[PDB]
Amino acid sequence: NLDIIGKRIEKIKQEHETSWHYDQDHPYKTWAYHGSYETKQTASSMVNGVVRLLTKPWDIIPMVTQMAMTFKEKVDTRTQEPKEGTKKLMKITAEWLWKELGKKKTPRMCTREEFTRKVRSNAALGAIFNKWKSAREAVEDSGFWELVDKERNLHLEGKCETCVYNMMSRAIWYMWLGARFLEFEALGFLNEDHWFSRENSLSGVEGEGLHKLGYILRDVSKKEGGAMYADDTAGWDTRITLEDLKNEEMVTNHMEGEHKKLAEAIFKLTYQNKVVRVQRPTTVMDIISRRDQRGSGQVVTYGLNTFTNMEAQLIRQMEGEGVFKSIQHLTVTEEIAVKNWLVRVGRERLSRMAISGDDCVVKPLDDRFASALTALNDMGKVRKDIQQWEPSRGWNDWTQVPFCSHHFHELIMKDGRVLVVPCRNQDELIGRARISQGAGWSLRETACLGKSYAQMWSLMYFHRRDLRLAANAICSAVPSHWVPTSRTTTHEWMTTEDMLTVWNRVWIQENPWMEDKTPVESWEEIPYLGKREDQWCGSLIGLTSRATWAKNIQTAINQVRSLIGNEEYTDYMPSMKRFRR
Ligand SMILES: NC(=O)N1CCN(c2ccc(F)cc2)CC1
Ligand SMILES: [Zn+2]
Numbered sequence: 001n002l003d004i005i006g007k008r009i010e011k012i013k014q015e016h017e018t019s020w021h022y023d024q025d026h027p028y029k030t031w032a033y034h035g036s037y038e039t040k041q042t043a044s045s046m047v048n049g050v051v052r053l054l055t056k057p058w059d060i061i062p063m064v065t066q067m068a069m070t071f072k073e074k075v076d077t078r079t080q081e082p083k084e085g086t087k088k089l090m091k092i093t094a095e096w097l098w099k100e101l102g103k104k105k106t107p108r109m110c111t112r113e114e115f116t117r118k119v120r121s122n123a124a125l126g127a128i129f130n131k132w133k134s135a136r137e138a139v140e141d142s143g144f145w146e147l148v149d150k151e152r153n154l155h156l157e158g159k160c161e162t163c164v165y166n167m168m169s170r171a172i173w174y175m176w177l178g179a180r181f182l183e184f185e186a187l188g189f190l191n192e193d194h195w196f197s198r199e200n201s202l203s204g205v206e207g208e209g210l211h212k213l214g215y216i217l218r219d220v221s222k223k224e225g226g227a228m229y230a231d232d233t234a235g236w237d238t239r240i241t242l243e244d245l246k247n248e249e250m251v252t253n254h255m256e257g258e259h260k261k262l263a264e265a266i267f268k269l270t271y272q273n274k275v276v277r278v279q280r281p282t283t284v285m286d287i288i289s290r291r292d293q294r295g296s297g298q299v300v301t302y303g304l305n306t307f308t309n310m311e312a313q314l315i316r317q318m319e320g321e322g323v324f325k326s327i328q329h330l331t332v333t334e335e336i337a338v339k340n341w342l343v344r345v346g347r348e349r350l351s352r353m354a355i356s357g358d359d360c361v362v363k364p365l366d367d368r369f370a371s372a373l374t375a376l377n378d379m380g381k382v383r384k385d386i387q388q389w390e391p392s393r394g395w396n397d398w399t400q401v402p403f404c405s406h407h408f409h410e411l412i413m414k415d416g417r418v419l420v421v422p423c424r425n426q427d428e429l430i431g432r433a434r435i436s437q438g439a440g441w442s443l444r445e446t447a448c449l450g451k452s453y454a455q456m457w458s459l460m461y462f463h464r465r466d467l468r469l470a471a472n473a474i475c476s477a478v479p480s481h482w483v484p485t486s487r488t489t490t491h492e493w494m495t496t497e498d499m500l501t502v503w504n505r506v507w508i509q510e511n512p513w514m515e516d517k518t519p520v521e522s523w524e525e526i527p528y529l530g531k532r533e534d535q536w537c538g539s540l541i542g543l544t545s546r547a548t549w550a551k552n553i554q555t556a557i558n559q560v561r562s563l564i565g566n567e568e569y570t571d572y573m574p575s576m577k578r579f580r581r
C-alpha cells in the first residue's frame with residue numbers, strides 16, 4: 001500500500017502545498033483517494049475540408065455527418081478474486097505460454113538511442129508537454145536523462161517518485177516521457193522484437209496489416225472444428241485482475257541481471273500499484289490509486305492484452321474439451337491433465353486462434369466451447385451484449401466473422417487469382433477520413449492527410465466502387481509530389497511511390513497465399529465486390545446523388561485545385577474505365 005505509492009503521493013502534495021485539501025464529497029468507491037489541488041483546462045475533432053469537398057453525397061448521410069460532432073462509470077467498478085482452481089489454471093497456462101513465446105526470442109533492454117529515434121519520427125508514446133515543449137526537445141537535453149537516471153536508481157532500490165498516470169469505452173493514461181522511457185527500457189522488447197508475431201506466438205497477428213488478416217482467418221477456417229467464435233469482452237482493460245498482472249510479470253522469469261530488476265520494478269511499482277491524477281469539475285486534481293486494471297503505455301498494453309487473452313481463450317478451450325471438471329479446485333490428477341494437454345496439443349490450439357489485444361477469433365475443436373463459460377466469467381472476462389450464462393453464438397462462414405473492426409470478402413480476379421480483402425460499413429470509412437485531430441493544420445497539411453486516407457483506400461478498399469473513385473479524385477486534387485502525413489501512425493500507403501506499384505508489391509509479390517507472381521499492369525485488372533455486395537456494405541451506387549457526383553467529379557477536383565492554387569497535379573481519373581474517355 002502507501003509505502004510504494006507514499007513517496008509519489010508525498011512529492012505531489014508539496015508542489016501544491018497552497019491547495020492540498022482532503023475532499024469529503026469525493027466520488028470514488030473503488031479508487032483509493034488521497035487529496036486534491038487547484039487546476040483549470042479542457043481537444044475536439046475538426047473536419048478535413050479536402051476530403052469533405054470530394055465526398056459531397058455524404059454531406060446528407062447522418063451516420064457520416066454525426067461522427068464529426070461533439071465509460072467512466074466502468075473505470076470505478078471492482079472485479080472479484082477468481083476461485084483457487086481458476087488461479088491454478090491461469091498460473092499453469094501463463095508459465096507454459098511465456099516459455100513457448102521465449103523459445104525463439106531473447107528478452108533484452110531497449111535503449112536511449114532507440115527511444116530517441118522513435119520520438120524523432122512520431123509514434124503515440126503518450127507523454128506530457130511542463131518543463132520542455134515536445135518530447136523531441138527533452139530527448140536532446142542531458143537534464144532529462146539525469147532525471148531518468150535518478151528514477152532508474154530509485155527503481156533499482158525498489159522505490160518510485162515520478163511514475164504517475166494522468167486520466168483523460170476509452171480511458172487514456174499519459175505519463176511524462178521519463179516514465180515512458182523506463183517502461184520502454186524494460187518491456188519495449190515485446191513489441192520491438194515481435195513476441196506476438198504469428199510466427200512466434202501462433203495465435204497473435206503483430207505486424208499483420210488488414211491485407212493479411214482475412215487470409216489468416218481463412219487459414220483458421222481450414223481447421224477441422226465447430227463454429228468460429230468472436231466474443232468481445234465488456235471493457236477488457238477494466239477487467240484485468242491483480243492475478244492477471246502477476247501472471248504477466250512472470251515474463252521477468254526469462255530475464256537476467258539488471259534487465260530483470262528493472263522489469264520487476266515496472267510491474268511492482270507502476271502496474272500492480274498505480275497513482276493517477278484526474279480532472280474533476282466540482283476543477284480540482286484527484287490523486288487516486290488502485291492495484292488492478294490495465295494502466296501501461298498503449299504498446300505494452302497491446303502485448304500484455306494479447307498474452308492474457310491467449311491464456312484465457314486456451315483455458316476456455318480446455319473447459320470445452322473437459323480437461324478440468326470444476327474451477328472451484330483442481331485435483332492433482334487435473335493439474336497433470338492441464339500440463340499434459342498444453343505439452344501435447346498447446347501449439348495446435350494456439351493455431352486455432354487469431355488474437356489482437358482484447359480482440360479474438362477462436363475455432364475450437366467443436367461447439368462445446370459455446371457453453372464453456374465458468375472459467376471465462378470467473379477470470380472476470382465477461383462477454384459484451386449477451387447474458388452471462390447464455391451460450392455464445394458462433395459464425396458458420398469465415399467471411400462474416402468480425403475482427404479488428406472489419407469483415408473479409410473472397411474476391412476472384414478475372415485471371416483466377418484469389419484476393420482476401422478487408423471491409424467495413426462504408427459510412428464508417430468516409431466518416432473517419434473527414435476528421436482531423438488537433439489544431440493549427442495548414443491547407444497543405446490538411447491535403448496531405450486527405451492523401452493518406454485516399455492512398456489507404458486505394459490499397460485496402462479498392463474493391464468498393466465509391467472509395468476507388470473518391471481515392472482517385474483526392475489524389476488528383478492534391479499536388480502529385482506532396483507527401484502523405486498522419487500525426488498518429490503495416491502502413492504501406494504512407495509513400496509517394498505510384499499506388500499501382502505498391503498494390504502489386506503488397507497483393508502479389510509479398511503475398512504468401514498467391515503462388516502466381518504475374519504483375520498487374522492496370523487498375524482495370526483489379527476487381528470490385530459484386531454491385532449488390534457493395535450496396536450491402538454501404539455503397540451509394542444506384543442513387544441520383546452518387547451518379548451526379550461521379551459524372552461531375554472533375555468539377556469537384558477543380559474546386560479543390562483552385563483552393564490549393566497553382567501546383568503540379570496528375571489526373572488519376574482515367575485509371576478507371578468510365579473516365580478512360
Ligand atoms: N495486426 C494487428 O493486431 N492490427 C490491429 C489493429 N488493426 C486495425 C484495427 C482497426 C482498424 F480500423 C484498422 C486496423 C490492424 C491490425
Ligand atoms: Zn518510478
Ligand SMILES: [Zn+2]
Pocket residue numbers: 407409423424537
Ligand atoms: Zn463488406
